[PDB]
């Protein structure tokens, strides 16, 4: 049995972008329990959310053999790494963040189209950095 | 104009889902980097990440008006935030984990499976410490 296809290369992909929320939530969930004072909370959903890296590892891991799970293409050596990067923010500047604020302008959400285009614009320098250190890299 | 209910909404979910995921992948980059030497290219991507960090950050601030990307529920009070944790955590344990080793059992892929399922215990143990700390919440 092959993975590139399967269901399981599927559900792989699945959990990866759940574990990888589950992170970023519980970071979230802890600075809230920093403010309010209760830092034994925010310890443990500190702590938790190690737990979840542990996980997302692993399934990237696995992943490698099938590809990025954010742009389909191979990545483990640093090249690889790099070129993956740069194609993912490419998609990210020049397609996704303008294309969604255009419709919250639309749907008239001004604050969030402007935030939708500041990350237009961090985008783009994440990808200009990532090809400037690719043309740069010795391996 | 109210967010719930809109293609931004569906829009923040879907940023955020990416943001999580791109620093989770630029961590793990960093960790190839690393071992190669590339010690340059390694703390760029950490500087990427945390980067993805802030924007996923903000994602999630603007869905405090709607609910967790991950379970609906409300979020922002440390009662409301262990609340939506152990949801999560109970329908991966209970259904979505298992649900994924049994079909990478069937598939063939029996290390896969075997990871899947502990994973389940480990989400099991997440929801039962979180169900813990919520019990002794002092609020
Ligand atoms: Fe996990
Ligand atoms: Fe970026
Ligand atoms: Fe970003
Ligand atoms: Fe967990």
């Known amino acids: 049995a092959q993975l590139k296809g399967s269901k399981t290369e599927e ?16 970071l979230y969930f802890a600075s809230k329990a920093d403010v309010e004072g209760q830092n034994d909370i925010a310890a443990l959903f500190r702590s938790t959310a190690e737990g979840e890296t542990g996980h997302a590892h692993g399934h990237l891991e696995y992943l490698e053999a099938v590809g990025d799970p954010a742009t389909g293409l191979p990545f483990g050596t640093s090249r690889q790494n790099l070129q993956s990067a740069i194609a993912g923010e490419t998609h990210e500047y020049t397609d996704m963040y303008p294309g969604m604020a255009k419709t919250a302008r639309d749907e008239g959400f001004e604050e969030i189209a402007n935030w939708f285009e500041t990350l237009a614009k961090a985008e783009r320098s994440h ?10 890299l010795v391996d």
Not at 11 to 26: I, V
Not at 127 to 136: I, Q, S, V, W
Request: aromatic share 16%; charged share 25%.
């Open 127 to 136: 990808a200009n950095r990532y090809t400037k250190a690719l043309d740069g």
């Open 11 to 26: 559900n792989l992909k699945y959990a990866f972008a759940g574990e990888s929320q589950a992170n970023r939530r519980y």
